[PDB]
Scaffold this active site. Sequence first.
Site, PDB file in Angstrom:
ATOM      1  N   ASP A  70       4.944 -11.970  -3.012  1.00 10.87           N
ATOM      2  CA  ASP A  70       3.628 -11.548  -2.559  1.00 10.87           C
ATOM      3  C   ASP A  70       2.509 -12.053  -3.455  1.00 10.87           C
ATOM      4  OD1 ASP A  70       5.008 -10.157  -0.581  1.00 10.87           O
ATOM      5  OD2 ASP A  70       4.605  -8.177  -1.439  1.00 10.87           O
TER       6      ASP A  70
ATOM      7  N   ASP B  80      10.662  -9.004   8.036  1.00 14.57           N
ATOM      8  CA  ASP B  80      10.846  -8.883   6.596  1.00 14.57           C
ATOM      9  C   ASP B  80      12.331  -8.778   6.256  1.00 14.57           C
ATOM     10  OD1 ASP B  80      10.034  -8.551   3.930  1.00 14.57           O
ATOM     11  OD2 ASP B  80       8.634  -6.926   4.439  1.00 14.57           O
TER      12      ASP B  80
END
Length: 468
Positions: free
Chosen positions: A275, A217
């Site tokens: 997301d 990430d």
Amino acid sequence: VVLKVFEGKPRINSPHIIGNYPSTPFIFYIPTSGQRPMQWSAEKLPEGLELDSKTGIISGVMTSKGDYTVTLKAENALGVSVKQLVIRIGDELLLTPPMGWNSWNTFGQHLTEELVLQTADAMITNGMRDLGYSYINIDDFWQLPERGADGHLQIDKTKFPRGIKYVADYLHERGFKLGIYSDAAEKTCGGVCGSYGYEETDAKDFASWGVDLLKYDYCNAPVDRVEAMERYAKMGRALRATNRSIVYSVCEWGQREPWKWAKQVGGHLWRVSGDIGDIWYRDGNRVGGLHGILNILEINAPLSEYAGPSGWNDPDMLVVGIDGKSMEGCTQEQYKSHFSLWCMMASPLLSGNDVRNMNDSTLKILLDPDLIAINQDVLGRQAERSIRSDHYDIWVKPLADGRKAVACFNRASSPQTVILNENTIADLSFEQIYCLDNHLTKSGSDSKELIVKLAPYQCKVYIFGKTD
């Protein structure tokens, strides 16, 4: 009637090609539908590998680069299935898109060893393992907030009292692969320890634990694109320096055009967007936060040229069946279209739902053998959205055998009719058509037209042409 996953004669399912690095551990469970008990065997299984006839797992280590064609056989009381498997030993992983499960949505900050093991057990018994779902991915908060004074990430031993390796071993014994999570900064998105500056140490630890995939990430890292590319390249080198074949999942939310560089720095898949939410439409780029299914389709549509074997565009998790549960949702038809298009786009098929307690309708979607076979097609083409009309899309995916998969997707809230003809898409062969809706083939037809009736939100898929 369609045969369920554990009934009928054996059917050896996709993937039919698998890549691994030389001199690293190799594990492959042969995904096989059909009634149990089942027995497996193989011809021309290369030196270095062995097949357990009782469990269906191929394991070992291959030291020589090349393509090896193995003939697999599955047998039960009702019959046999024989299928070729190509094993490529080289520098190419994920020759088909990865399939599996990510822990975040279900368990958040409350994942434990017990809950990962329960998830693995459920994937065995619910059919997912036999349809090719193999990755079980631990997300954020497996580690403590601070790096140890010894220079290593600290496993949260309350969550994982026997460590991560215990979990990896349990998974590997059952043909699953283990994913883990870190971040290209001092701290992860959740605020626990990341890997920036310790990439080599962390990669070596992951490999020692038997990790098979790293999701990496980009929280708390500089926006700067050259810096991002360098941080991802650094971890890529660290992973390749270990003694495992570790899949590298790049997650920087599509902000720096990762489709132009992620594969080049060692990534096997890369997030193309922010997301996904369990929602049909939401423009996350406008209001911030989660993106709807439709919105991610718009983002991924023009990116087909950047995808292929060993380098996939990642449109985020499958929200199929979440039903607004979290830890409102979408309709069943919306979830089905979401799955169908992820298949057509050669997307990772990573479920974010709780796979221990899904209903039949959810599994009917996630276990669809024809759609998965399309996703796992060895040519590895991400479908192009050839037409985006006012109410519907036409997506087209060339297949390895020379045929074309065609998906007619109704975006609208009302029924729509699509008339496919010889002028709809270039080079579309009407001499043979397989319809996924009813599993029927129309052969040697005089008709150059197909009427496609779509319910609201429905996606119907067809395969046009004769095989080579």
